[model samples]
Target: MKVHRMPKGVVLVGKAWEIRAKLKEYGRTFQYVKDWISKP
Candidate 1:
């Protein structure tokens, strides 16, 4: 998982390869997180 905002934090604690594999299908999810934290 990926953290987005303060309360909207997403946990991504797990196997590196496994996490990537799982997120590969939800690539946008990571982007959302990056965009969220990149704000202000």
Candidate 2:
């Protein structure tokens, strides 16, 4: 998975399965994740 370590937090991406796993682990929806990564 592509782990984007942003200033605020981390973003788990890449494969759909891994993304879904991290999404559950981090409790974030894919909808709002990019909103965080797109900026700071």
Candidate 3:
């Protein structure tokens, strides 16, 4: 069995909507993905 912990929040930055959608889709497709975006 695999155990995972959720983060407090997510901050994704992209120049285009397509990239945003794709990244979000990828995260949705994989349940183990964690938010790594940093705010500027």
Candidate 4:
């Protein structure tokens, strides 16, 4: 899996190659997931 920055503070996490296509196809079905990653 991979991660990417998205609108409205949304953090995309899923198969690296498929994330973008998935977003375009199912945008309304996805949203941000706070603290889905850790920062130092």
Best by TM-score: 2
lDDT values, one for every candidate: 0.68, 0.69, 0.63, 0.64
Model 2, runs deviating above 4 Å: 1-14, 28-40
For each candidate, give its TM-score against the true structure: 0.28, 0.32, 0.31, 0.25
lDDT of 1 by residue, 1-40 (tens): 4754555456555699788887887775556667678656
**Candidate 3 CA-lDDT value:** 0.63
Local accuracy of candidate 4 as per-residue lDDT tens digits, 1-40: 3654544565556697698788888776433454465667
Q: What TM-score would candidate 4 get against the native? A: 0.25
All models, RMSD in angstroms:
15.1, 15.6, 17.7, 17.3
> For residues 1-40, could you state the per-residue lDDT of candidate 2 as single tens digits?
4754554455555698877888797995577676667754
Off by over 4 Å in 4: 1-14, 28-40
Write the residue-wise lDDT of candidate 3 on 1-40 in tens digits.
2644754466565668788788998777543444455557
lDDT pick, better of 1 and 4: 1
Task: Tell me the number of clashing residue pairs for each predicted model.
Answer: 1, 0, 0, 0
Give the clashing residue pairs of candidate 2, or none.
Answer: none
Return the top candidate by lDDT. 2
Error of 1 at 22 (Å): 0.9
